[model samples]
Target: MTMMDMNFKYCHKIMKKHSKSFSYAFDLLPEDQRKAVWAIYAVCRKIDDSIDVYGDIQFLNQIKEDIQSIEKYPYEYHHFQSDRRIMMALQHVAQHKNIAFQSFYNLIDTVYKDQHFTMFETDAELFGYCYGVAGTVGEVLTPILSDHETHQTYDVARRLGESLQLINILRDVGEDFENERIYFSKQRLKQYEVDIAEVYQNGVNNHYIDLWEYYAAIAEKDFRDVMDQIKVFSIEAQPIIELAARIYIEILDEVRQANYTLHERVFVEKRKKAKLFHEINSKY
Candidate 1:
């Protein structure tokens, strides 16, 4: 196999191992786009894995160095196996798509900031965090997903990423607290009287449930708005995007139906995902 072929396989394995939800949708993409998506997902997952231990100064510096390598010599000779594969695949995709290097830079900065700043002070700050962590994914992937990119499509794509991230934040509330990371705004937490201690002790009460539902409603609206923009994509690409959005939004639906209980982890089962995939193929 060619070097690019080997690198693509490595990225595909990482994508499947790290994020099954995204991998499912990614599997629906046409060959070239699917490979590109796998490369992007692998890079994002690598960044995420490295940043989880942000308290380590050495690891932080290593991440900076890795980003520099990615920016400077993505297509050239590389050192580490993981970094080389991701950069190689990303470089191939970058040549075809208008992926801004700055998005990866911004994402790295956000990951670095997470080492120091855990709680967001305002809605704007929280949304900015979402943009850094997840919105960048949409921004970079849009060129691959859409042939006719309008201002509105990119905007909706970013919002779509943000909405899915918000769902993730809500779903992982208890876990995030356990990890000493809080994506919720300090103002909103105070307004709702959501105490970490209470959440740790009582799973989900009225205050936490109310706060969860509030964000769920926001994400639900975003999913609706983003679905409208899917028409801009080619018919072949539309179903893939639609399937991803539907699967993620269903997690929120499960939360609401469960009365906002944050204890048990929520996810779509394989059977349900298969059903959704079949439905999407039929409709879109």
Candidate 2:
């Protein structure tokens, strides 16, 4: 039942390699649920790698078209006449789990945005970016994870997804700057009048600290806004999400402990993650 023979072994490795903190949730799920999640993660990883790791938005669009074929012309996808394992794997899970194809296309829409990137000038635009990249993930997962779906459940799921994006934005300030992308509110950056050069050097810039905390507070509130709403999902799936939410939240908390400095990367280490998992079982 490992689905070890499954096409998702690449997915299994990618998930473990790219994100161990994320892997904790994989461990928490029942086998079928876990396999479904891994397949979705693999396809996502494929699209992301094509842009961020390789080159060309053109190739990403090819993957986009393939996704359409899976939804409509699924039987003849091989007519595309290429070696696309990830899409076929996606096809298997879509059929098995009855996931919505539009979710995959929405995710491609986000990945397409990753190219030709620039600073986000306003909060509206930033949240919109989060919605495209992260919040859309909620649309895909809710169908697999929950037996009961209401509008409220989907709303809360998107919030949790965007909350993780916020933490990622908070933690990667220096790196993102190095990469020629600035996701922080540029308007607020100007208002604070913080010097990006000093912040990039990993020195403690007082003005930048305030700016960082402003975004950090929003991320914290995002988690607080939805953590208790796990009840909106089925009882069986709650703890898996509860742990995943706390793990990402823990990354943000570590940044706070370091005074929001982006010099060194922040994460929940293995030993501490063990304690956190133990606390999960202890809580409810």
Candidate 3:
């Protein structure tokens, strides 16, 4: 069965207007999985957007309950007001394969923790959040693809998730800084003798450039480490996953090309991203 007519229409509108590359890549999945994945993305987006748009304590707590519902039941429930897509989409996929609700829950947890927490003191603490928010998605994603086994791919998925998140950290440097949220480890900055204030105020400084290079090198190494398994993803899902990686990676490169300056606007080409949809199933 296809997604409910209303939900299908609703998800389409969100994807089309907000996320071009992901929407296009999502269309390439096998019909049943595609519908469910779209549902997954839609629900996740809703929850995430709510957190971003409203910083209310009550609303955040309500969303936290919605996330906890996913953790408790694992499947069953579609009409929930806060977690509709997550419930429906996950219920559909659970009928066919195991889905990691723990990681999904962890995503919500990371955001909630961030609402109260500050900069992590060490690399370990920083990655703890990164693993929950991003690496966890990698863990959740593999099982959604046909013939994609989580056991065999867990390590790579974890690595890819971390790598992708590092890219996000690089891309959102200014936004995160402006909000007084720093995902980069303070320990590393101290290690490099880099002053955070210098980078924050100047936006173009040696300290910032040095720090950007440090993380980009780490992101690149992580990406290369997972190359062996990149080709193992099911045909339908590979390119969507790959393009997300590319878009994020390109953002990190832009961070460097700007000499670690966060002033200049940086983003990937829409036309180039559209091209990736055409090539999802194409053999290299």
Best-fitting candidate, scored by TM-score: 2
What digit string (tens of lDDT, one per residue) describes model 1 on residues 134-245?
9988877788888888887679778988998998987777678777788879898899999766777877788887877777888888888888877876677888889988
Looking at model 3, which ten-residue stretch has the lowest summed lDDT? 78-87
Rank list by lDDT: 1, 2, 3
- lDDT value for candidate 3? 0.68
Going through the candidates in order, what is the number of backbone clashes in each? 0, 0, 0
Segments of candidate 1 deviating more than 4 angstroms: 52-82, 257-259
Deviation from native of the Cα of residue 140 in model 1, angstroms: 0.9
**Superior by TM-score: candidate 1 or candidate 2:** 2
Q: How many collisions between residues are there in candidate 2?
A: 0
Error of 1 at 9 (Å): 1.2
Alpha-carbon shift of residue 4 in model 3 (angstroms): 1.1
Please write out the lDDT profile of model 2 over residues 6-57, one tens digit for every residue. Answer: 5667667777787787787765788777767777777776766776444667
Candidate 3: segments with Cα more than 4 A from true spot: 1-3, 15-19, 52-54, 60-79, 83-86, 146-148, 274-283
